Design a protein around this ligand. Structure first.
Ligand SMILES: Cc1csc([C@@]2(CN)[C@@H]3CCN(c4cnc5c(-c6cccc(Cl)c6Cl)[nH]nc5n4)C[C@@H]32)n1
Length: 485
């Protein structure tokens, strides 16, 4: 779990909580209340609290005096399992948070009538939510749908959850220190009624899926902040996505990664055909077009990048970065020819639009003329140094052009997409592209689910979509596209 993350605490509350409810080796993570975008790792040692800053400007979580990571879970996992790397500070005992805010099933101040509508309309068998009790302030209510699939056969069931002396119960039996512990217990051990109805908690109720028509209303709802609630609930689910990255950790592949600990998952990684099969890259299939999310090239991986492009039959490359070296120049100068190991790349022509440069590249394998094909490299140049674009028109027009290019090429491979780490901008672009392609094919009358789409992408490469600003920007981009339609 990710219960070590406390989203609503101050730094004083963090200290007092570690000093009273913790011991030496206890830790918690928390958002920087002063500077939103940043986080803090507060750890206890020798009867005292030490606070370590973690910045995320959009590319990666940068631990101050430490390594760079794709998620906070992957960060915590690394230092719990690699002793003496954090300087010496040991992470031993995660101080768990009681606050239900960032759980999928928690709906806050939601009325009883409006909870019943949602379960009738959107819910199915085992769909549940927890809400603050209208009657008794302090108490909560667990509303569960049961039965089949107007119809008759299904039904809603409410269950009062009493708060007595800082612990929670359903009117009998065990008393839990948090609503999470309560809900997770009755997931495992369903309540059965007197006439044999099993009150199963199969899935939380989906309220993030919208019809694309009502995007403007939902953005208006999320602005009055509701964007934070939706985003930090998504962040809490990253503990489900700690899949193995063993191949990126091998000694043979250590210097092939730009960021040592931002690694590709084994089950989705691009395998190239002593240890010559590795590249820090992942196939992203939506759940029809696909993508490869990868890092910006190092000097020592340019040959591998071109082998990947060739192997995968990729015809479109989206580069999304223009005072640091985020990428090494892996393409020849205009009109020039280069050999990158066994691969050969001519730059036929460059074309400047306002937001981007297009480079027409002819890729072939050395010794084989018949292997040639055109790769169209779209270099996006107007992404700001700090934050996200204030208007999404540029990204949308860019992606529209990129899409029409890919669609013009018969049996083209996945669209290669990269930035610095291959997770922030790369993830924000790919997700915008997934959501826009839904609307493009099936029109304004179709359902879309922003955080679900991100989670599905996050399960294929670590930490795809990095910040709340990028999360907000995806919404704003999808909104702008529907308005300009
Ligand atoms: C204090 C307070 C007041 S209202 C509120 C909440 C958050 N608990 C209520 C509950 C509904 N919700 C949600 C619901 N599904 C969310 C997904 C999500 C959606 C689909 C699949 C997956 Cl895998 C995920 Cl991870 N991410 N983010 C989500 N947020 C937003 C709002 N909290």
């Amino acid at each position: 779990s990710r219960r070590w993350f406390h989203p609503n605490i101050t730094g004083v509350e963090a200290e007092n909580l570690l000093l009273t409810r913790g011991v030496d080796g206890s830790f918690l993570a928390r958002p920087s209340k002063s500077n939103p975008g940043d986080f803090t790792l507060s750890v206890r040692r020798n009867g005292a609290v030490t606070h370590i800053k973690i910045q995320n400007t959009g590319d990666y979580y940068d631990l101050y005096g430490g390594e760079k990571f794709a998620t906070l879970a992957e960060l915590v996992q690394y230092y719990m399992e690699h002793h003496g790397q954090l300087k010496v500070i040991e992470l031993k005992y995660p101080l768990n948070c009681a606050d239900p805010t960032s759980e999928r099933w928690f709906h806050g101040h939601l009325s009883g009538k409006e909870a019943e509508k949602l379960l009738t309309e959107k819910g199915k068998h085992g769909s549940f939510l927890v809400r603050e009790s209208q009657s008794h302030p302090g108490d909560f209510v667990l509303s569960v749908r049961t039965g089949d699939d107007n119809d008759g056969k299904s039904k809603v069931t409410h269950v009062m959850i009493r708060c007595q002396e800082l612990k929670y119960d359903v009117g009998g039996g065990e008393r839990f220190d948090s609503l999470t512990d309560l809900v997770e217990h009755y997931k495992k051990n369903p309540m059965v009624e007197t006439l044999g109805t099993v009150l199963q908690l199969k899935q939380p109720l989906n309220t993030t899926r919208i019809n694309a028509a009502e995007i403007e209303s939902r953005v208006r709802e999320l602005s009055k902040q509701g964007f934070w609630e939706e985003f930090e609930t998504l962040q809490q689910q990253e503990c489900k996505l700690l899949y193995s990255r063993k191949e990126g950790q091998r000694q043979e592949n250590k210097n092939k990664n730009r960021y040592k600990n931002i690694l590709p998952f084994d089950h989705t990684r691009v395998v190239l055909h002593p240890v010559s099969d590795y590249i820090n890259a992942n196939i992203i299939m939506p759940e029809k077009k696909s993508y490869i999310a990868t890092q910006g090239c190092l000097q020592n991986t340019v040959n591998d990048f071109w082998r990947m492009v060739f192997q995968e039959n990729s015809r479109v490359i989206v580069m999304t970065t223009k005072g640091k070296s985020k990428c090494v120049k892996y393409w020849p100068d205009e009109y020039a020819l280069k050999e990158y190991g066994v691969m050969r790349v001519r730059n036929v022509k460059e074309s400047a639009a306002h937001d981007y440069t297009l480079r027409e590249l002819k890729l072939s394998k050395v010794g084989q003329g018949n292997t040639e094909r055109t790769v169209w490299q779209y270099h996006f140049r107007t992404w700001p140094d700090h934050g996200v674009p204030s208007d999404p028109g540029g990204v949308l027009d860019f992606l529209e052009e990129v899409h029409h290019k890919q669609e013009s090429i018969m049996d083209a491979g996945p669209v290669v997409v990269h930035c610095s780490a291959g997770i922030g901008r790369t993830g924000t672009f790919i997700v915008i592209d997934i959501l826009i392609d839904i609307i493009r094919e099936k029109g304004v009358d179709c359902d879309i689910d922003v955080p679900k789409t991100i989670q599905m992408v996050r399960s294929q490469r670590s930490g795809m979509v990095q910040t709340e600003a990028q999360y907000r920007f995806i919404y704003m981009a999808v909104q702008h596209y529907i308005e300009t339609l």
